[PDB]
Amino acid sequence: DSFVIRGDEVRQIAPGQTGKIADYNYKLPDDFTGCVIAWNSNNLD
Amino acid sequence: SALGKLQDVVNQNAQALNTLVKQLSSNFGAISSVLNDILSRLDKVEAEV
To answer: Looking at beta carbons, which residues of chain A come within 8 Å of B43?
Structure first.
């Protein structure tokens, strides 16, 4: 599952979280089995 | 004082049940012993712990 977010929002990409990204966009289940991988693509701008 | 044996059995039953109910008020290291506090003061991940 793949997307771009602001760096401060990356902490919301975890099971059972709450906040705008975790509530209105991409919610991981409380028993999620998986890996979350992220990097600042800041040179893209 | 004659019926001490039967009154002791009634007292032990009441003492056991009151002890079992009073233990609902204990924290056991939790943030509160009121379960609705835990479910309202915390996010679901911390609340489950």
So the answer is: 16-18
